[PDB]
Design a protein. Structure first.
Length: 261
């Protein structure tokens, strides 16, 4: 597998605050098609890595999603967290801005002054995001089936039919979400998808912010997000059990998976 990076994973290595690779970051100097961005990247992955673009929720900023940047990059990904043009952008606009961010990561990969010059495999991309940014991730996946993985959290969308999504999709949900209640948003979205590898992981007692920066389940959520992205962005079957397994955890009130390998 030409995309395999890093040592053999363990539960311990995936639950730790940081993976094996050293992380650096920069502010996007000329954000093009979205508000602002921060790029996180490994300095020692030893080969090109895939890129992931992460979008916040309604009213929210990069701070809500920032923790994913170092957590994923330290496992061998280039991650761009964005601010949207407006904090009140809706899911469709969030998707357009997410894909703009992936395009700018591709531009920076081809720009000799950029810290990520030649670090990105632009054929291997993923999408993540919170709430309306999670709905935007699912729209991104529906419109761009060459995306390798999607892992939205507490997704919100007024349209829950994502039956056209063929991208491997992990939905993080928050049991006690009042803003994007699971029975109206995350679970109908999950149930709509009959064409893909998919997973539903609902955090016991979670509020709408249960997967955001500062959450108290970074060990499990980080392990699952990294394992999903490793399995499906890197085709890395070392991560098949971590990606597909039921955690069987007090921290997980509802687990479902289908077509997972």
């Amino acid at each position: 597998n030409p995309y395999a990076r890093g040592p053999n994973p363990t539960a311990a290595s995936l639950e730790a605050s940081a993976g094996p690779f050293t992380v650096r970051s920069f502010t996007v100097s000329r954000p093009s098609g979205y508000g602002a961005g921060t790029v996180y990247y490994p300095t020692n992955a030893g080969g090109t890595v895939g890129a992931i673009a992460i979008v916040p929720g309604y009213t929210a900023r990069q701070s809500s999603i920032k923790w994913w940047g170092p957590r994923l990059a330290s496992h061998g990904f280039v991650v761009i967290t964005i601010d949207t043009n407006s904090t009140l952008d809706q899911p469709s606009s969030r998707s357009s801005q997410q894909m703009a961010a992936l395009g700018q990561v591709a531009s920076l990969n081809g720009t000799s002054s950029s810290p990520i010059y030649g670090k990105v495999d632009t054929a291997r991309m993923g999408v993540m995001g919170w709430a309306m940014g999670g709905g935007g991730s699912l729209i991104s996946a529906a419109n761009n089936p060459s995306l390798k993985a999607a892992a939205p959290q507490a997704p919100w969308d007024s349209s829950t039919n994502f039956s056209s999504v063929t991208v491997p999709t992990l939905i993080f949900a928050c049991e006690n979400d009042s803003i994007a209640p699971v029975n109206s948003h995350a679970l109908p979205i999950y149930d709509s998808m009959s064409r893909n590898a998919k997973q539903f992981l609902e955090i016991n007692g979670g509020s709408h912010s249960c997967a955001n920066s500062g959450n108290s389940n970074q060990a499990l959520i980080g392990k699952k997000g990294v394992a999903w992205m490793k399995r499906f962005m890197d085709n890395d079957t070392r991560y098949s059990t971590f990606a597909c397994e039921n955690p069987n955890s007090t921290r997980v009130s509802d687990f479902r998976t289908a077509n997972c390998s």
